[PDB]
Design a protein around this ligand. Sequence first.
Ligand SMILES: CCCCCCCCCC(=O)OC[C@H](COP(=O)(O)OCC[N+](C)(C)C)OC(=O)CCCCCCCCC
Ligand SMILES: CCCCCCCCCC(=O)OC[C@H](COP(=O)(O)OCC[N+](C)(C)C)OC(=O)CCCCCCCCC
Ligand SMILES: [Ca+2]
Ligand SMILES: [Ca+2]
Ligand SMILES: [Ca+2]
Ligand SMILES: [Ca+2]
Ligand SMILES: [Ca+2]
Ligand SMILES: [Ca+2]
Lengths: 741, 741
Amino acid sequence: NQQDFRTPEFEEFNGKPDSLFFTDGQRRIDFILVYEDESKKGTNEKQKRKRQAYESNLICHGLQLEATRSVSDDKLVFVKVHAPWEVLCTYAEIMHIKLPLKFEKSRMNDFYSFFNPATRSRIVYFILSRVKYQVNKFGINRLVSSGIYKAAFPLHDCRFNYESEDISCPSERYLLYREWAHPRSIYKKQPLDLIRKYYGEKIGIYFAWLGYYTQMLLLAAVVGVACFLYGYLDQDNCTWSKEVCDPDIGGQILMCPQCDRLCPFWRLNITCESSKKLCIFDSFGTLIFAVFMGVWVTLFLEFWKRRQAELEYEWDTVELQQEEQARPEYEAQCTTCGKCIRVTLCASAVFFWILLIIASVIGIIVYRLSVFIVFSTTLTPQMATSITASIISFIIIMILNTIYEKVAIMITNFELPRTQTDYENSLTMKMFLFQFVAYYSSCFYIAFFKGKFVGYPGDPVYLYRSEECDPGGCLLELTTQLTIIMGGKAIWNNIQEVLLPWVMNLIGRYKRVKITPRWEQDYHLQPMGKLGLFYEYLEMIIQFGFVTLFVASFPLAPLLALVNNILEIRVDAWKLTTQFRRMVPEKAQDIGAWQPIMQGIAILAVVTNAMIIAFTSDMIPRLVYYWSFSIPPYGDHTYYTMDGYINNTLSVFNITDFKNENPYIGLGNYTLCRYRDFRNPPGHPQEYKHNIYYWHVIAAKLAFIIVMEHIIYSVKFFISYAIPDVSKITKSKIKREKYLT
Amino acid sequence: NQQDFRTPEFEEFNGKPDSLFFTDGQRRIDFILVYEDESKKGTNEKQKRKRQAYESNLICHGLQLEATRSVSDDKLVFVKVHAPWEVLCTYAEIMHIKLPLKFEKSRMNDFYSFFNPATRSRIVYFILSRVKYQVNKFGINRLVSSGIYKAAFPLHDCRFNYESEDISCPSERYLLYREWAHPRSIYKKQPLDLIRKYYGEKIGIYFAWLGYYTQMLLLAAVVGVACFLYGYLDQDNCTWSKEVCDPDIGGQILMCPQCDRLCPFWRLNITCESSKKLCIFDSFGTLIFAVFMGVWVTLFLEFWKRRQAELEYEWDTVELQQEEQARPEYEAQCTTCGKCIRVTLCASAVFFWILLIIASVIGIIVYRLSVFIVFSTTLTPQMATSITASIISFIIIMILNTIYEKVAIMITNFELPRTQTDYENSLTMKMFLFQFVAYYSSCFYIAFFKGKFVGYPGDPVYLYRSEECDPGGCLLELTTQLTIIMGGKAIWNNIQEVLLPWVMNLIGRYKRVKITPRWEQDYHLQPMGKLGLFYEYLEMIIQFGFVTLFVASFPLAPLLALVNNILEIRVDAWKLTTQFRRMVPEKAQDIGAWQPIMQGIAILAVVTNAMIIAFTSDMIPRLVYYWSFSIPPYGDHTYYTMDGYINNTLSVFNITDFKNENPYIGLGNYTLCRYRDFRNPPGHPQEYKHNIYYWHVIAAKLAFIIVMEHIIYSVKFFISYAIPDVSKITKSKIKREKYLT
Ligand SMILES: CCCCCCCCCC(=O)OC[C@H](COP(=O)(O)OCC[N+](C)(C)C)OC(=O)CCCCCCCCC
Ligand SMILES: CCCCCCCCCC(=O)OC[C@H](COP(=O)(O)OCC[N+](C)(C)C)OC(=O)CCCCCCCCC
Ligand SMILES: [Ca+2]
Ligand SMILES: [Ca+2]
Ligand SMILES: [Ca+2]
Ligand SMILES: [Ca+2]
Ligand SMILES: [Ca+2]
Ligand SMILES: [Ca+2]
């Protein structure tokens, strides 16, 4: 318990470049602790005292340590840490590790190189965290946080690209780089058992979840492509789009200006090309695919639960949960009311940043309003404005995202979660809320609040001059925004993931920090961090939200996500294998709070899709016209039809503007202009007021919302009730295990 | 394992009337087995052989048996069964019973009359079920089912009304009859710990759940009475009801006949008294109470979960679940596809009975249509018809309920569930489905399908002549039906529960089957049955459905349920204590599938209340008129108001009937009659067609449904997320137990 003897067999050796064993080679390296001591104000002496005390306690606990001087930096010292068989057995009895038994699985010790390097490293890390050094001080995490130990990490088997020089060593890292984690193997299956063996249950479960997600996205994308091709082949029969394109009918419709000044009365001809591709995106194919996706999200969740149960059986992810140690930062600072006030203050700051991104969205709105005029003066101008606004909003969101990552780390540090699990949960909720708002605010605005509250040309709604939507609807604009944001986020995240660790390693090599041992080689790598796969999970959950929430706009979102996931598996695996220092294996029976987040997103997706179809799409007005306003009571046709829809939907407007300006007279010489609304024509007893057609349409929209929501929720409940969360084969295997044992 | 020696100390004694011990009095009675053997075709010999083998096996296992001849029936033999201390200890080690420890609680045996009579009986019953007698035969349940043993049951402490003759015996039954299970103690608290000690965890958890349910109903009823009194005090300001009552305005409205023949054109005056009491039942008070109940159901569920966790800690309801034995009926008969086909056939039969009760509802509809004419020819006739139909439907439902109980037992016997738990689950789902349909079909019809599809007087909707609703709405009729069904079911169930066991015991005494011992006294009692509190749970769940689903009609449903529960606690406790043979204690950590049923009812209640308020109540039309049709654009009043609502809502009808009969001319000499619909007046370009007012009203109804459902579901989610399911005190106690142990 005191610093008496530390660091035996202190001897420098680098002749063996690829070896995970000690100088004698009898016992392997389970951990590496990196420090430096030769080079003020007594701090060096204090750190030396504390480190010597910790090393003495470690050796007293039974571990074997051997330190070598770095061949490059004379001040760096690497301490290789190995655990004897007796220590491994006793600390595997302390924490109930399941081992192969004659391949049955059971508790602390079984009957049967016996411990894999991953579990050896896990046991050694548990010992390092438990052993005290000193008031009381707990373990190695506090030493690392205090700068006493520069690093502490396990070792990789070998170089990822080259086979290990040692022949008895199975080059698992090389195999995982060759048959995995490499674009050359982009098509092969994932060796989930092997990657679990090499990295741990957390990484294994993440990669299994990603693979299952890709598998389900394959089915969703196939069905979406089927619906999209149905809509594409029915393009020749778009009655309303053909009518818009027709100069005889759509050409004679003079739409009123959108802005007050310097915007001409424009004919509907300029909307022909956009209408052609819009008819594909708002059709019965997209409606059927929205219903199918409502079913498919439930299928995805249920089958992931079944796969998770299967993996819980096969990998034994359920271990006894020992009391989680308090974080060193929390324990350094140690009333309850004050900490509650601090939590409320942190939440206030987070909602302040949410208000900031909302203000950014409002700024984008103002940019659209200001730039439409210059686009018109100088590929219709409205489409160009929409595309440019989408690009600018995407860039602004991406720029804000990194700053929010930094300040979210700052905020979660300012508040004090005692355990790493509490830190992870708080960061999860905070980060997910901000990412949700930032990445979905513009899409939600385009879907639900763009063009909905504008009024008629007389007495328009001012904020100033709220955005008016296109006569065909804003579903095309929403689809463009979704494509831009989703594809750009995917590409940008992949580029950042590939480059940032690689660039950091390259600059580390350039700073000169030839033959070098394994501990040095792995030390010259970027640490993954205390969080781990948090950002990978967050990215995948954001992609899932994009796929599910706005699937009613275009059916190709599952296909885009499928391509993104096929690339994502390989990029994540490659960076984890090559560019990052090895992490201590953990145990995880699920994905964490991300699964409740996905369940909430699944519940919200039904409402979002129903409201998208009802409000942002013109399908309900078209159906209402076809079934009720082409018949004799309100129309002239003998049978149900869609012709005349454009002429009978748009409302007339004689030029009589309220003086509460009248810019139409200054902007043109025309007398009657048509606007996309369902108000009464001029000369009516109640002119410019909502009419029977408007109320019929809105009643149909609300009835569709109610019917779709209730039917889809009922079907989801029935499917969840019908599908058992545990597979029959897994049940049989569990019963066999219980019977044998 | 063979019948060699059975039934030691076979000696008849009845001198001690109140004693739970053997003839020597040293060891107590843990069980009683009743049989008879002296009195064909060799069956008596076969049963004698099997019973002797079972008794020999019982004695070999360590139990002590002593049989006495019945003092009344010479053929009846009672076998008292006692377990020695060693047998109790070994079979308490086999199944991990938690015992007091120095009062901490822990596993099979602790350090400290030691076993309560309840747990002694539970251990002895476990032994009886496990011991084999014989192909292989399992235990005592098969013998009882086969008629070998006439009965097998534990004993009560004493007579419920008289203190036990023995002085060392704590008369727990007498105490539980004096301070509980008695109307004289209708106001006192429930000794939950004492009743759990005497009966078991199942009975204890049921009574605790009932008490908590009553406690929450108290709050719900107080709030409902507040809202009801608000509506009652605002009765003097009901503008529309006062207008209806006014002969100057409501008296001049001539409503068209409802039936085709022999129904007069009737003035709205006859609706004045019903409108007066309807204004109380459809108001903002009832709306606010519906929202409050939406919150209150979530509060109820969350706090019941917290109370359940507290009881799990305090009573140790979580025991190790040994493998449940197969039912004797299932094991007597022992492919999978055939049994699946049988299950589908049984489900088809159940849905057939559901169709039968639906046909009964249709018959009630036909009865109303046929009897309104005779009521009019011979307390307005429509109200009299509604009340009589409610009474008849209630009687028919009650008559069908018992027959369905019998045939549901038959169906669950026809299908083969291997375990009693599977039997309980299947019977639960089947019985709950039928009870739901039977008790809610008429209410759902009145709420959602009565008067909704009738058309206008020209071209009315025929099935024939679907029921037309009152001008004020059918919320009053729904409230009357709810009051009738709920109160009648409560009274009828209480009367049946009180009388049926008591009547059976009385007729058993009358059939002569004076001083008698404890085993005979308890044998002359009605057995509870293998199900137990299944019907009590079902009754309470049906009452909960009545309270929650239709709470938007009248706010006094929680008060009625509160009175019913205050009576129900005492009646259930009294019958369980006095009229029923004692049951073996069980262990239960919750109420079972009834909790998922309650969660489903809670989810459905939001939709049901929103749709009730929107469709069956006139609040939405009144609000729409006030805010949009009393203003100059559609009305003449300068400010928002409600006057003129009756005259401006009802639609006119000139007498021009389609010849697709024309009975109006034969039934009266009038020319213009007003009907409750929002169609255009005669002479309009599109007359007798839905108008802008109708579409505005329906759009408002659907918007209200959407807004209310989404807001209430969001609030329920937030409340469930905010409330932790485990109380802080229970968490502290669990942490203290973990720290000490
Ligand atoms: C819960 C997460 C998602 C929430 C999304 C909320 C979206 C709300 C959208 C909304 O209220 O939009 C306005 C609607 C529909 O009016 P539209 O007929 O689409 O507007 C006409 C536009 N025009 C003048 C160019 C012809 O105007 C109405 O009359 C609709 C009133 C009913 C709203 C129901 C939604 C309430 C949700 C809580
Ligand atoms: C889920 C468990 C509960 C289900 C309850 C379903 C209730 C359906 C009721 C229904 O559709 O009723 C017809 C509605 C109401 O219009 P009303 O104005 O009440 O009908 C005319 C009545 N009058 C001639 C005497 C003036 O007329 C309409 O146009 C309503 C159409 C919108 C129906 C939305 C509900 C769909 C639920 C799945
Ligand atoms: Ca990526
Ligand atoms: Ca990633
Ligand atoms: Ca399921
Ligand atoms: Ca009752
Ligand atoms: Ca009862
Ligand atoms: Ca909760």
